CSV table of C-alpha atoms (C1' of nucleotides) and ligand atoms in Angstrom, one decimal:
chain,number,residue,atom,x,y,z
A,12,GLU,CA,91.9,110.6,104.7
A,13,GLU,CA,93.1,112.8,102.5
A,14,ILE,CA,95.2,112.8,98.9
A,15,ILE,CA,98.4,112.9,98.9
A,16,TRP,CA,99.1,114.6,96.0
A,17,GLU,CA,103.0,114.3,96.2
A,18,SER,CA,102.9,111.1,95.1
A,19,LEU,CA,102.8,108.5,91.5
A,20,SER,CA,99.7,107.1,90.5
A,21,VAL,CA,99.8,104.0,88.0
A,22,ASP,CA,97.3,102.2,86.5
A,23,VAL,CA,97.0,99.2,84.4
A,24,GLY,CA,94.6,99.2,80.8
A,25,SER,CA,93.2,96.3,79.0
A,26,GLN,CA,91.6,95.2,75.8
A,27,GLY,CA,90.7,91.7,77.5
A,28,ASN,CA,90.9,90.0,80.8
A,29,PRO,CA,93.5,87.8,79.6
A,30,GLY,CA,93.4,90.3,76.4
A,31,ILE,CA,96.3,93.4,75.4
A,32,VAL,CA,98.2,95.0,78.3
A,33,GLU,CA,99.6,98.2,78.9
A,34,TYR,CA,100.2,100.4,82.1
A,35,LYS,CA,101.2,103.9,83.2
A,36,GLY,CA,102.3,106.7,85.7
A,37,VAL,CA,101.4,109.6,86.2
A,38,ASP,CA,101.8,112.8,88.9
A,39,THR,CA,98.9,112.7,90.7
A,40,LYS,CA,99.1,116.1,90.7
A,41,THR,CA,99.3,117.1,87.3
A,42,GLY,CA,98.4,114.2,85.2
A,43,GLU,CA,101.9,114.1,83.3
A,44,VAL,CA,102.3,111.0,81.7
A,45,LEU,CA,105.4,109.7,83.5
A,46,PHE,CA,106.2,106.2,82.3
A,47,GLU,CA,104.2,104.3,78.9
A,48,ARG,CA,104.5,101.0,78.2
A,49,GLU,CA,104.0,99.3,75.2
A,50,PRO,CA,101.2,96.6,75.3
A,51,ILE,CA,101.5,94.1,75.5
A,52,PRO,CA,100.2,90.4,73.6
A,53,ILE,CA,97.9,88.7,76.4
A,54,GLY,CA,98.1,89.1,80.3
A,55,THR,CA,95.9,90.0,83.0
A,56,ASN,CA,94.3,93.2,84.2
A,57,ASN,CA,96.3,91.6,87.9
A,58,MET,CA,99.6,91.1,86.3
A,59,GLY,CA,99.5,94.4,85.0
A,60,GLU,CA,98.8,96.4,87.8
A,61,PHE,CA,101.9,94.9,89.7
A,62,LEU,CA,104.2,95.8,86.7
A,63,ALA,CA,102.4,99.1,86.8
A,64,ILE,CA,103.1,98.9,90.4
A,65,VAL,CA,107.0,97.3,89.8
A,66,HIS,CA,108.1,99.9,87.6
A,67,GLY,CA,107.0,103.0,89.6
A,68,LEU,CA,109.1,102.0,92.3
A,69,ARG,CA,112.0,101.3,89.7
A,70,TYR,CA,111.4,105.1,88.3
A,71,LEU,CA,111.4,106.8,92.3
A,72,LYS,CA,114.2,104.5,92.9
A,73,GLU,CA,116.3,106.1,89.6
A,74,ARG,CA,115.2,109.4,90.3
A,75,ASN,CA,116.6,109.1,94.1
A,76,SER,CA,112.4,110.0,94.7
A,77,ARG,CA,110.8,109.2,98.2
A,78,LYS,CA,107.3,109.9,96.9
A,79,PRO,CA,104.7,107.3,97.5
A,80,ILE,CA,102.9,105.0,94.8
A,81,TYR,CA,98.4,105.1,94.9
A,82,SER,CA,97.8,101.8,93.4
A,83,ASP,CA,94.1,101.0,92.9
A,84,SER,CA,94.2,97.4,92.8
A,85,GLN,CA,94.3,95.2,96.1
A,86,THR,CA,95.6,92.3,95.0
A,87,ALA,CA,98.8,94.2,93.0
A,88,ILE,CA,99.4,95.5,96.3
A,89,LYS,CA,99.4,92.7,98.0
A,90,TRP,CA,101.0,91.3,95.6
A,91,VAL,CA,103.9,93.3,95.3
A,92,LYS,CA,103.9,93.2,99.8
A,93,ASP,CA,104.9,89.8,99.0
A,94,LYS,CA,107.3,89.7,96.1
A,95,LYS,CA,105.2,86.8,94.2
A,96,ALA,CA,103.3,87.6,91.7
A,97,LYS,CA,100.0,85.5,91.9
A,98,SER,CA,98.3,85.2,89.1
A,99,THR,CA,96.4,82.0,87.8
A,100,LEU,CA,97.3,82.6,84.2
A,101,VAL,CA,98.2,80.0,81.7
A,102,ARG,CA,102.0,80.3,81.4
A,103,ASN,CA,102.8,79.2,77.8
A,104,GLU,CA,104.6,80.2,74.7
A,105,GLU,CA,101.3,82.9,74.4
A,106,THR,CA,101.2,84.1,78.0
A,107,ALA,CA,105.4,84.3,77.9
A,108,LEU,CA,106.6,87.8,77.4
A,109,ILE,CA,103.8,88.8,80.4
A,110,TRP,CA,105.1,86.1,82.7
A,111,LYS,CA,108.8,86.8,81.4
A,112,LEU,CA,107.6,90.3,82.1
A,113,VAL,CA,106.4,89.1,85.8
A,114,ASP,CA,108.9,87.1,86.9
A,115,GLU,CA,111.8,89.6,86.3
A,116,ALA,CA,109.6,92.2,88.0
A,117,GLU,CA,110.0,89.3,91.4
A,118,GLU,CA,113.4,89.3,90.8
A,119,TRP,CA,114.1,93.2,90.9
A,120,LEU,CA,111.9,93.1,94.2
A,121,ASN,CA,114.0,90.8,95.8
A,122,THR,CA,117.1,92.2,94.4
A,123,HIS,CA,116.3,96.1,96.0
A,124,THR,CA,115.6,97.9,98.7
A,125,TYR,CA,113.1,100.9,98.8
A,126,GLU,CA,111.0,102.8,101.5
A,127,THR,CA,108.6,103.6,98.3
A,128,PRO,CA,104.7,103.6,100.8
A,129,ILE,CA,102.3,102.0,98.3
A,130,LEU,CA,99.5,103.5,98.9
A,131,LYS,CA,95.4,102.2,98.0
A,132,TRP,CA,93.8,104.8,95.8
A,133,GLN,CA,90.3,105.3,97.5
A,134,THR,CA,88.0,105.0,94.5
A,135,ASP,CA,85.2,105.2,96.2
A,136,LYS,CA,85.6,108.6,98.1
A,137,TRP,CA,88.3,110.0,95.5
A,138,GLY,CA,86.7,108.4,92.1
A,139,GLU,CA,88.8,107.1,89.7
A,140,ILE,CA,93.3,107.0,90.1
A,141,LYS,CA,94.2,109.8,87.9
A,142,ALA,CA,96.5,107.4,85.3
A,143,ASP,CA,93.2,105.1,84.6
A,144,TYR,CA,92.2,105.1,80.4
A,145,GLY,CA,88.6,106.5,80.1
A,146,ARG,CA,87.9,102.6,79.1
A,147,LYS,CA,85.7,101.4,81.4
B,30,A,C1',82.6,91.0,100.0
B,31,C,C1',86.5,93.8,98.4
B,32,A,C1',89.4,95.4,94.8
B,33,U,C1',90.1,95.8,90.2
C,1,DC,C1',77.1,90.3,81.2
C,2,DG,C1',82.4,88.7,80.5
C,3,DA,C1',87.8,88.5,83.7
C,4,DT,C1',91.6,88.6,87.6
C,5,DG,C1',92.5,88.0,92.9
C,6,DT,C1',92.2,87.9,98.6
D,205,LIG,CL1,107.0,95.7,83.2
D,206,LIG,CL1,103.2,108.1,102.3
D,207,LIG,CL1,95.3,97.4,99.3
D,208,LIG,MG1,93.7,99.7,88.4
D,209,LIG,MG1,91.8,101.9,85.5
D,210,LIG,RB1,118.8,105.6,94.0
D,211,LIG,RB1,89.6,102.3,82.4
D,212,LIG,RB1,88.8,100.7,89.6
D,213,LIG,RB1,84.8,87.2,92.4
RNA sequence: ACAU
DNA sequence: CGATGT
């Protein structure tokens, strides 16, 4: 219904899908960029959306912050809930890095706890999430 | 269909 | 127009 402004918003950006993937997290209220991942040569939109949420969880936990996380990705929210990124991307030498990071993010989820609400950013009502890359 |  | 996902 209403935006929870006291929150962290995350999003993927890419060049191609599959293609070069990056992600970032921003303060929903101010747009301040709080973290940005260096581009990964090949990944998918959904893998990057998943990594962005898990990075947000780790970022907030390290800082003892109870803020929720907004994501625009129905898929990645479910993958985090399930602790399992069900990507179709081939696992090969070219995709090794993204898959390593996804595997490590799942491993983190399986070894840590959090109460962080992971909320759907309602793009249809609120416009683009504040972490968006402005590329579409 | 919906979400990217 | 193409792609990734539930
Ligand atoms: Cl990562
Ligand atoms: Cl909340
Ligand atoms: Cl959702
Ligand atoms: Mg997104
Ligand atoms: Mg975006
Ligand atoms: Rb902590
Ligand atoms: Rb964009
Ligand atoms: Rb979107
Ligand atoms: Rb589709």
